[PDB]
Tab-separated table of C-alpha atoms in Angstrom:
chain	number	residue	atom	x	y	z
A	27	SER	CA	96.539	89.811	105.845
A	28	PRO	CA	100.050	90.845	106.959
A	29	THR	CA	102.636	88.087	107.375
A	30	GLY	CA	106.130	87.577	108.741
A	31	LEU	CA	109.337	88.873	107.198
A	32	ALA	CA	109.786	85.927	104.849
A	33	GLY	CA	106.356	86.126	103.260
A	34	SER	CA	106.439	89.908	103.228
A	35	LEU	CA	109.575	89.847	101.088
A	36	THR	CA	108.301	87.574	98.337
A	37	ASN	CA	105.101	89.592	98.209
A	38	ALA	CA	107.004	92.845	97.900
A	39	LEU	CA	109.326	91.578	95.186
A	40	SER	CA	106.539	89.996	93.153
A	41	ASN	CA	104.559	93.227	93.050
A	42	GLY	CA	107.726	95.191	92.387
A	43	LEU	CA	108.746	92.974	89.495
A	44	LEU	CA	105.269	92.959	87.972
A	45	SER	CA	104.964	96.731	88.238
A	46	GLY	CA	108.397	97.097	86.683
A	47	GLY	CA	106.994	95.659	83.480
A	48	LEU	CA	108.780	92.357	84.022
A	49	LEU	CA	106.373	90.552	81.728
A	50	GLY	CA	106.858	93.434	79.326
A	51	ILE	CA	110.595	92.839	79.406
A	52	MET	CA	110.088	89.175	78.543
A	53	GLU	CA	107.975	89.919	75.476
A	54	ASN	CA	110.762	92.053	74.026
A	55	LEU	CA	113.592	89.538	74.159
A	56	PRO	CA	115.509	89.759	70.857
A	57	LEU	CA	116.158	86.225	69.620
A	58	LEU	CA	115.687	87.030	65.948
A	59	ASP	CA	118.791	89.174	66.318
A	60	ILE	CA	120.550	85.980	67.374
A	90	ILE	CA	112.045	82.095	60.120
A	91	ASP	CA	110.420	84.169	62.856
A	92	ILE	CA	110.050	84.007	66.630
A	93	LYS	CA	107.396	85.820	68.642
A	94	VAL	CA	107.291	85.919	72.436
A	95	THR	CA	103.995	85.507	74.278
A	96	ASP	CA	102.332	84.400	77.523
A	97	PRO	CA	104.883	85.567	80.081
A	98	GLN	CA	104.199	84.656	83.698
A	99	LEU	CA	105.985	85.208	86.996
A	100	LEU	CA	105.744	82.402	89.528
A	101	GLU	CA	105.905	81.963	93.291
A	102	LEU	CA	109.278	83.297	94.390
A	103	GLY	CA	111.325	81.107	96.694
A	104	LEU	CA	113.557	81.921	99.624
A	105	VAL	CA	116.354	80.064	101.362
A	106	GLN	CA	118.613	80.905	104.267
A	107	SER	CA	122.060	79.548	105.053
A	108	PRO	CA	122.220	77.282	108.152
A	109	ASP	CA	124.197	80.089	109.790
A	110	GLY	CA	121.264	82.388	109.135
A	111	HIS	CA	123.752	84.988	107.959
A	112	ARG	CA	123.120	84.586	104.242
A	113	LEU	CA	119.935	84.804	102.189
A	114	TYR	CA	119.220	83.598	98.657
A	115	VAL	CA	116.164	84.200	96.489
A	116	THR	CA	114.961	82.096	93.571
A	117	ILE	CA	112.897	83.741	90.846
A	118	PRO	CA	111.036	81.194	88.698
A	119	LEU	CA	109.663	82.390	85.376
A	120	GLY	CA	107.476	80.904	82.662
A	121	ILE	CA	107.185	81.850	79.011
A	122	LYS	CA	105.760	80.799	75.643
A	123	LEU	CA	107.391	81.499	72.296
A	124	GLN	CA	105.969	80.677	68.879
A	125	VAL	CA	107.963	79.985	65.733
A	126	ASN	CA	106.992	80.244	62.077
A	127	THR	CA	108.863	77.658	60.030
A	128	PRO	CA	108.134	76.689	56.410
A	129	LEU	CA	108.564	73.056	57.438
A	130	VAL	CA	105.452	70.941	57.015
A	131	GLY	CA	104.734	69.756	60.555
A	132	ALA	CA	105.942	73.003	62.053
A	133	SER	CA	104.073	75.570	59.985
A	134	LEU	CA	103.094	76.995	63.340
A	135	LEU	CA	104.453	75.828	66.673
A	136	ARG	CA	104.412	76.931	70.304
A	137	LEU	CA	106.942	75.952	72.959
A	138	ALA	CA	106.583	76.277	76.717
A	139	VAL	CA	109.843	76.945	78.525
A	140	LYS	CA	110.450	77.237	82.270
A	141	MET	CA	113.296	79.290	83.733
A	142	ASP	CA	114.754	79.763	87.217
A	143	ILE	CA	117.024	82.489	88.581
A	144	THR	CA	118.824	82.411	91.911
A	145	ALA	CA	120.564	85.330	93.556
A	146	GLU	CA	122.084	86.317	96.881
A	147	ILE	CA	120.806	89.384	98.701
A	148	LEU	CA	123.300	91.615	100.482
A	149	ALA	CA	123.013	94.405	103.029
A	150	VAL	CA	124.737	97.599	101.962
A	151	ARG	CA	125.256	100.835	103.862
A	152	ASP	CA	125.047	103.760	101.454
A	153	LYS	CA	124.566	107.498	100.944
A	154	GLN	CA	124.024	108.912	104.420
A	155	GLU	CA	124.132	105.387	105.841
A	156	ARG	CA	120.701	104.071	104.770
A	157	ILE	CA	121.554	100.317	104.323
A	158	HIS	CA	119.688	99.278	101.082
A	159	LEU	CA	119.533	95.686	99.720
A	160	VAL	CA	121.176	94.711	96.439
A	161	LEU	CA	121.857	91.625	94.343
A	162	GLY	CA	125.039	89.645	94.807
A	163	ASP	CA	125.677	86.643	92.593
A	164	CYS	CA	122.739	86.952	90.208
A	165	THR	CA	123.173	84.052	87.806
A	166	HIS	CA	120.938	81.593	85.992
A	167	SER	CA	120.048	78.483	87.973
A	168	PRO	CA	122.511	75.864	86.598
A	169	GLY	CA	120.262	73.026	85.470
A	170	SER	CA	116.660	74.180	85.306
A	171	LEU	CA	115.591	74.645	81.705
A	172	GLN	CA	112.391	72.822	80.792
A	173	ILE	CA	110.847	72.924	77.325
A	174	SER	CA	107.725	71.266	75.934
A	175	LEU	CA	105.288	71.482	73.023
A	176	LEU	CA	101.968	73.315	73.125
A	177	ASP	CA	98.662	72.496	71.417
A	178	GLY	CA	99.388	68.783	71.814
A	179	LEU	CA	101.651	68.531	68.780
A	180	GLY	CA	103.915	65.548	68.182
A	181	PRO	CA	107.678	65.638	68.634
A	182	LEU	CA	108.516	62.828	66.206
A	183	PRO	CA	107.257	64.764	63.153
A	184	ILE	CA	110.106	67.224	63.688
A	185	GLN	CA	112.063	65.639	66.543
A	186	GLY	CA	115.202	66.317	64.538
A	187	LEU	CA	114.286	69.953	64.001
A	188	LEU	CA	113.564	70.676	67.657
A	189	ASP	CA	117.068	69.459	68.448
A	190	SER	CA	118.309	72.517	66.581
A	191	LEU	CA	116.311	74.954	68.694
A	192	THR	CA	116.738	73.377	72.124
A	193	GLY	CA	120.486	73.385	71.619
A	194	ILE	CA	120.488	77.032	70.606
A	195	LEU	CA	118.146	78.292	73.312
A	196	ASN	CA	119.951	76.508	76.143
A	197	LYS	CA	123.069	78.399	75.111
A	198	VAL	CA	121.499	81.804	74.551
A	199	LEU	CA	118.496	82.068	76.875
A	200	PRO	CA	120.054	81.929	80.367
A	201	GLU	CA	122.429	84.721	79.385
A	202	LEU	CA	119.715	86.814	77.771
A	203	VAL	CA	117.241	86.376	80.607
A	204	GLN	CA	119.559	87.126	83.517
A	205	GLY	CA	120.921	90.070	81.565
A	206	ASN	CA	117.509	91.715	81.491
A	207	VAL	CA	115.972	90.521	84.748
A	208	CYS	CA	118.822	91.069	87.216
A	209	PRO	CA	118.986	94.814	86.560
A	210	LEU	CA	115.270	94.978	87.342
A	211	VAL	CA	115.445	92.878	90.497
A	212	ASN	CA	118.239	95.108	91.749
A	213	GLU	CA	116.236	98.287	91.197
A	214	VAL	CA	113.237	96.723	92.907
A	215	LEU	CA	115.238	95.913	96.027
A	216	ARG	CA	116.269	99.561	96.176
A	217	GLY	CA	112.596	100.433	96.562
A	218	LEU	CA	111.728	98.075	99.386
A	219	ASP	CA	110.173	99.164	102.662
A	220	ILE	CA	112.794	100.673	104.950
A	221	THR	CA	111.418	98.811	107.945
A	222	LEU	CA	111.242	95.576	105.986
A	223	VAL	CA	114.905	95.878	105.121
A	224	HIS	CA	116.171	96.776	108.590
A	225	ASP	CA	114.277	93.878	110.121
A	226	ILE	CA	115.593	91.362	107.610
A	227	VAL	CA	119.139	92.633	107.972
A	228	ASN	CA	118.868	92.587	111.755
A	229	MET	CA	117.779	88.981	111.459
A	230	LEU	CA	120.591	88.052	109.097
A	231	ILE	CA	123.306	89.739	111.129
A	232	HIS	CA	122.429	87.894	114.310
A	233	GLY	CA	121.887	84.760	112.257
A	234	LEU	CA	118.230	84.117	112.927
A	235	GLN	CA	116.288	81.856	110.603
A	236	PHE	CA	113.002	83.419	109.532
A	237	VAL	CA	112.320	81.395	106.405
A	238	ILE	CA	110.120	78.303	106.456
B	18	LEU	CA	113.659	113.689	110.647
B	19	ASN	CA	110.873	113.274	113.204
B	20	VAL	CA	108.319	110.577	114.010
B	21	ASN	CA	104.547	110.966	114.228
B	22	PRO	CA	102.256	108.033	114.992
B	23	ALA	CA	99.397	108.911	112.644
B	24	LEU	CA	98.227	107.306	109.398
B	27	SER	CA	101.330	96.810	101.131
B	28	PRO	CA	103.977	94.683	102.864
B	29	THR	CA	106.388	96.073	105.438
B	30	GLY	CA	108.325	95.387	108.626
B	31	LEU	CA	107.242	93.468	111.700
B	32	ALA	CA	105.904	96.347	113.780
B	33	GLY	CA	103.865	97.921	111.009
B	34	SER	CA	102.504	94.490	110.179
B	35	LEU	CA	101.510	93.939	113.786
B	36	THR	CA	99.532	97.154	114.145
B	37	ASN	CA	97.778	96.656	110.817
B	38	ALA	CA	96.971	93.153	111.976
B	39	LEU	CA	95.527	94.414	115.236
B	40	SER	CA	93.914	97.419	113.582
B	41	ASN	CA	92.051	95.276	111.084
B	42	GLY	CA	91.485	92.585	113.681
B	43	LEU	CA	89.682	94.877	116.096
B	44	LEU	CA	87.516	96.593	113.500
B	45	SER	CA	86.333	93.189	112.330
B	46	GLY	CA	85.987	92.422	116.021
B	47	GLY	CA	83.773	94.230	115.783
B	48	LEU	CA	85.175	96.643	118.338
B	49	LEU	CA	83.413	99.592	116.738
B	50	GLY	CA	80.122	97.878	117.480
B	51	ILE	CA	81.053	96.969	121.032
B	52	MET	CA	81.885	100.596	121.789
B	53	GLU	CA	78.533	101.833	120.512
B	54	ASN	CA	76.591	99.386	122.667
B	55	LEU	CA	78.230	99.929	126.038
B	56	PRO	CA	75.668	99.618	128.836
B	57	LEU	CA	76.188	103.021	130.427
B	58	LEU	CA	72.523	103.168	131.327
B	59	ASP	CA	73.143	100.370	133.796
B	60	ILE	CA	75.186	102.713	135.976
B	61	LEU	CA	72.004	104.575	136.854
B	62	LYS	CA	69.977	101.383	136.979
B	76	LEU	CA	59.862	104.024	147.412
B	77	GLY	CA	62.306	106.852	148.092
B	78	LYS	CA	65.109	104.390	148.732
B	79	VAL	CA	64.467	102.586	145.451
B	80	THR	CA	64.529	105.901	143.576
B	81	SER	CA	67.789	107.503	144.733
B	82	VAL	CA	70.963	106.081	143.181
B	83	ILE	CA	74.094	106.945	145.168
B	84	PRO	CA	75.727	110.078	143.653
B	85	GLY	CA	73.124	112.364	142.185
B	86	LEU	CA	73.034	111.621	138.504
B	87	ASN	CA	69.423	110.509	138.978
B	88	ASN	CA	68.147	113.178	136.629
B	89	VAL	CA	69.753	111.635	133.561
B	90	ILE	CA	67.013	109.982	131.585
B	91	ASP	CA	69.113	108.289	128.941
B	92	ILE	CA	72.734	107.938	127.886
B	93	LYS	CA	73.292	107.318	124.190
B	94	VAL	CA	76.661	106.180	122.853
B	95	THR	CA	77.500	107.389	119.355
B	96	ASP	CA	80.373	107.976	116.937
B	97	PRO	CA	82.854	105.379	118.113
B	98	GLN	CA	86.225	105.438	116.387
B	99	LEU	CA	89.596	103.705	116.457
B	100	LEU	CA	92.693	105.857	116.160
B	101	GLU	CA	96.134	104.823	114.989
B	102	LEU	CA	97.533	102.102	117.200
B	103	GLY	CA	100.926	102.830	118.675
B	104	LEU	CA	103.810	100.555	119.562
B	105	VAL	CA	106.678	100.819	121.989
B	106	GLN	CA	109.443	98.325	122.645
B	107	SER	CA	111.495	97.908	125.813
B	108	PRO	CA	114.862	99.704	125.865
B	109	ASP	CA	116.445	96.275	126.230
B	110	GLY	CA	114.044	94.982	123.609
B	111	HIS	CA	112.421	92.095	125.442
B	112	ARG	CA	109.093	93.727	126.235
B	113	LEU	CA	106.437	95.058	123.873
B	114	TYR	CA	103.511	97.362	124.652
B	115	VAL	CA	100.644	98.535	122.453
B	116	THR	CA	98.441	101.576	123.011
B	117	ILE	CA	94.910	101.426	121.664
B	118	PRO	CA	93.459	104.930	121.316
B	119	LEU	CA	89.672	104.883	121.435
B	120	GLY	CA	87.004	107.532	121.003
B	121	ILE	CA	83.363	107.965	121.931
B	122	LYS	CA	80.671	110.626	121.805
B	123	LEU	CA	77.988	110.750	124.468
B	124	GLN	CA	74.449	112.100	124.506
B	125	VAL	CA	72.783	112.593	127.876
B	126	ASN	CA	69.088	113.242	128.438
B	127	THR	CA	67.561	115.301	131.240
B	128	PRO	CA	63.947	116.364	131.839
B	129	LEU	CA	64.852	119.964	132.630
B	130	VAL	CA	63.644	122.714	130.322
B	131	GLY	CA	65.681	123.776	128.864
B	132	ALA	CA	68.624	121.420	128.639
B	133	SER	CA	67.361	118.254	126.989
B	134	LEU	CA	70.754	117.237	125.637
B	135	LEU	CA	74.303	117.094	126.946
B	136	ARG	CA	76.908	116.155	124.358
B	137	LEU	CA	80.107	114.681	125.748
B	138	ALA	CA	83.226	113.663	123.845
B	139	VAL	CA	85.366	111.032	125.533
B	140	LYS	CA	88.815	109.820	124.546
B	141	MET	CA	90.829	107.112	126.267
B	142	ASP	CA	93.768	104.790	125.670
B	143	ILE	CA	94.373	101.131	126.448
B	144	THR	CA	97.994	100.148	126.945
B	145	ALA	CA	98.457	96.404	126.978
B	146	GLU	CA	101.656	94.383	127.196
B	147	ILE	CA	102.286	91.789	124.517
B	148	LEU	CA	104.149	88.833	125.947
B	149	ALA	CA	105.924	85.896	124.363
B	150	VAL	CA	104.801	83.032	126.561
B	151	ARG	CA	105.078	79.280	125.992
B	152	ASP	CA	102.549	76.590	126.873
B	153	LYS	CA	102.800	72.998	128.074
B	154	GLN	CA	103.717	71.836	124.578
B	155	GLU	CA	106.808	74.027	124.763
B	156	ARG	CA	105.471	75.945	121.766
B	157	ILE	CA	105.479	79.732	121.806
B	158	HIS	CA	102.477	82.050	121.643
B	159	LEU	CA	101.861	85.782	121.650
B	160	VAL	CA	99.747	86.353	124.751
B	161	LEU	CA	98.196	89.449	126.313
B	162	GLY	CA	99.671	90.672	129.575
B	163	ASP	CA	98.761	93.692	131.661
B	164	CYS	CA	95.848	95.102	129.692
B	165	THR	CA	95.032	98.309	131.530
B	166	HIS	CA	93.526	101.737	130.914
B	167	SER	CA	96.238	104.314	130.275
B	168	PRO	CA	96.029	106.419	133.479
B	169	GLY	CA	96.206	109.980	132.167
B	170	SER	CA	94.574	109.281	128.818
B	171	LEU	CA	90.956	109.791	129.809
B	172	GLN	CA	89.784	113.145	128.478
B	173	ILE	CA	86.207	114.390	128.438
B	174	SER	CA	84.947	117.348	126.439
B	175	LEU	CA	81.760	119.385	126.795
B	176	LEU	CA	81.199	120.017	123.072
B	177	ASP	CA	77.959	121.975	122.742
B	182	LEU	CA	73.319	126.602	132.969
B	183	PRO	CA	73.037	124.558	136.156
B	184	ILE	CA	74.580	121.756	134.114
B	185	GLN	CA	77.931	122.425	135.775
B	186	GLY	CA	76.580	120.552	138.782
B	187	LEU	CA	75.428	117.555	136.778
B	188	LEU	CA	78.348	117.622	134.360
B	189	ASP	CA	80.523	117.560	137.444
B	190	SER	CA	78.795	114.401	138.594
B	191	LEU	CA	78.634	112.745	135.183
B	192	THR	CA	82.322	113.083	134.366
B	193	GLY	CA	83.125	111.646	137.760
B	194	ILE	CA	81.286	108.417	137.069
B	195	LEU	CA	82.569	108.225	133.512
B	196	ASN	CA	86.113	108.562	134.804
B	197	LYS	CA	85.507	105.729	137.244
B	198	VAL	CA	83.426	103.380	135.105
B	199	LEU	CA	84.372	103.804	131.442
B	200	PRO	CA	87.910	102.457	131.842
B	201	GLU	CA	86.903	99.286	133.676
B	202	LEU	CA	84.013	98.906	131.252
B	203	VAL	CA	85.929	99.443	128.028
B	204	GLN	CA	88.980	97.536	129.211
B	205	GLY	CA	86.704	94.722	130.309
B	206	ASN	CA	85.262	94.480	126.821
B	207	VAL	CA	88.301	95.266	124.693
B	208	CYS	CA	90.963	93.185	126.451
B	209	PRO	CA	89.284	89.885	125.564
B	210	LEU	CA	89.076	90.963	121.927
B	211	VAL	CA	92.718	91.931	121.500
B	212	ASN	CA	93.756	88.801	123.381
B	213	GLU	CA	91.827	86.801	120.814
B	214	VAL	CA	93.398	88.528	117.823
B	215	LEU	CA	96.933	87.982	119.119
B	216	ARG	CA	96.234	84.277	119.426
B	217	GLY	CA	94.960	84.301	115.853
B	218	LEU	CA	97.898	86.097	114.279
B	219	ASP	CA	99.922	84.799	111.357
B	220	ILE	CA	102.320	82.071	112.461
B	221	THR	CA	105.448	83.466	110.842
B	222	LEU	CA	104.503	86.918	112.084
B	223	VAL	CA	104.411	85.624	115.633
B	224	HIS	CA	107.644	83.660	115.319
B	225	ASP	CA	109.685	86.502	113.861
B	226	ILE	CA	108.411	88.914	116.498
B	227	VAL	CA	109.177	86.590	119.389
B	228	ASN	CA	112.695	85.964	118.140
B	229	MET	CA	113.391	89.685	118.049
B	230	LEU	CA	112.256	89.980	121.643
B	231	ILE	CA	114.245	87.004	122.893
B	232	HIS	CA	117.431	88.553	121.555
B	233	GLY	CA	116.351	92.081	122.445
B	234	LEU	CA	116.479	93.596	118.981
B	235	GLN	CA	114.757	96.922	118.389
B	236	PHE	CA	112.265	96.516	115.563
B	237	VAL	CA	109.908	99.274	116.625
B	238	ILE	CA	110.724	102.753	115.394
B	239	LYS	CA	111.376	105.486	117.939
């Protein structure tokens, strides 16, 4: 069933991202370039939306989920799977272009400051290699947010350029006159 | 660079029509149309004659109902919103005169109804039906398939005078129900556009 502007956006983006091979982009992240690491189980979550108290500005949060597996010769970690959660926030801007068609684009697309969450799969124990994991978690937290937002943001931008013309104009018209439509 | 009201997530207007379109079909409007009691218009010499002389008709069968693409128009100021519901109906009329047997009529009509943004005694806002009325010059009857031109002349007259009030009387409650059962955010966003008079319907 059709919904308001808010809900219609998140539904449009989700489908757009998924169709853009978003999950496919995740499974091709080169970490070996920076043992062995294979990327699996990508999943896109419920997008979020927030609107400035003025109603003039609109931000979107894109939560992702992913599972990578590592092959270490260590004893407890012969095979290991980690589950890591990631969030991306970005501002959406109204832009007149071409013959004045007003398409939406990304503004400040950066990784959400403190929102990296890692855990162990298959019910393994941390203590057996709690000193080893410290090596990874430190590395990932300093190489993932840059790698992710460097591959996702160009996709999110291209998706916004393919939104429904009437969806855009309505949202913009709301933003301009500062009308809250998000709940 | 030209609009044509004929034939996924999208704007407010397009969401509204699709909401009403799917809301009427699951009404089920298409069933209501096909079961209109047109035979009641016809239903010892005083008990036999029935006002204008359409007495000969034996039976009136309603077939092939269809819903066309709903249309939307917004006030030039942008505070008022009207919807046109284009309907369709075939008609089969039975006479005992050999040879006629069957008259096939094709009727098309529109229902233009105002969508208001009213508020109740809880100060909360609803989308409520307003002037639901038959679109005056929308009624159009077609002959489709010898002295019939005297009966046809009488039939169309009654159809023109009854079908609107009949259809409108059966459709208006339906659409009024759907509007009150719309998505909450859909309603809210639409109202807000109207309050501030912002064109969200394409023209």
